[PDB]
Ligand binder design. Structure first.
Ligand code: HEM
Ligand code: HEM
Lengths: 145, 145
């Protein structure tokens, strides 16, 4: 299932993922917070899963939110690093899904992260071509949920 | 407290962490699996916390074990990347501790990783000076548990 989704990660898709990550991943705190705060702004209902973070309206200034935002970027770093080995990509993706499954986050719910990613990419001038590539990586994770 | 523990990361300690991570972090899969397999070998009592992983003695061949091993290395990468800013290091450590606190992992239990780290460093010709530097970073996490 996850292997089949990983199959959509073609040579060109992986190339665009790596090229865009070279920029997005160069500021994990800034872009990580941008992703998270954008998710909450565009889909307020997702805040229901983050009661532990406290006052999320504080954004970057909220230590817990900042800690979470920086940390999510290392999961993405992990994924990008394993792109050339399907066997490793699949095992770290299934490992990553464990806690999200326990939190009862469905594939559909997880997919809401696509909008924020598209917006963050656009802020760095990466068009639809790149957004589509990232949607395919997100789809690999969705296959594990 | 974690804030006092973070202040123990002096200039030279941070430098030694970076110099050793440059090598250790070069092969996250290899060193990650080595680190975890060594933990189970020197402290069989910790295996109980990893029932989900299955037969841990299979090592690299165990997909779940390999997935976990690679993933733990990105947490260390996160810590090293935050050494420049104490405020960020602290919020990232507290974030990291959440799930370990839920699993009932004590500071004493977590500290068992020092042995494996010392042995992996030694395998790459990094002596006691580096093992002690890493023990200080581990102490920051211990203060949060
Ligand atoms: C590209 C997207 C995402 C990445 C890379 C990501 C990454 C992570 C990472 C690494 C953690 C810490 C480890 C863990 O507890 O599993 C985490 C925690 C969590 N994630 Fe995900 N996640 C993403 C999207 C989502 C979405 C869309 C939701 C919910 C709608 C979600 C909800 C959570 C929650 C509630 C936690 C715990 C937060 C806390 O209490 O600190 N994640 N995620
Ligand atoms: C260098 C030290 C360590 C690092 C960097 C590390 C890193 C991580 C990371 C990143 C995760 C995945 C996210 C999460 O679920 O929290 C995790 C999971 C876990 N950790 Fe830690 N950890 C370390 C040591 C330990 C130790 C010493 C124990 C137990 C004695 C422990 C027990 C666990 C368990 C049981 C899981 C879940 C495994 C699974 O079911 O996949 N960790 N750890």
């Amino acid at each position: 299932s996850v292997y089949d989704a990983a199959a959509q990660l073609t040579a060109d898709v992986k190339k665009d993922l790596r090229d865009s990550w070279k920029v997005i991943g160069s500021d994990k705190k800034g872009n990580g917070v941008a992703l998270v705060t954008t998710l909450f702004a565009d889909n307020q209902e997702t805040i229901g899963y983050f009661k532990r973070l406290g006052d999320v309206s504080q954004g970057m200034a909220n230590d817990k939110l900042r800690g979470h935002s920086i940390t999510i970027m290392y999961a993405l770093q992990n994924f990008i690093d394993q792109l050339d080995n399907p066997d490793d990509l699949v095992c770290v993706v299934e490992k990553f899904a464990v806690n999200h499954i326990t939190r009862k986050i469905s594939a559909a719910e997880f997919g809401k992260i696509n909008g924020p990613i598209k917006k963050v990419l656009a802020s760095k001038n990466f068009g639809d071509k790149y957004a589509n590539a990232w949607a395919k990586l997100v789809a690999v994770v969705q296959a594990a949920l």
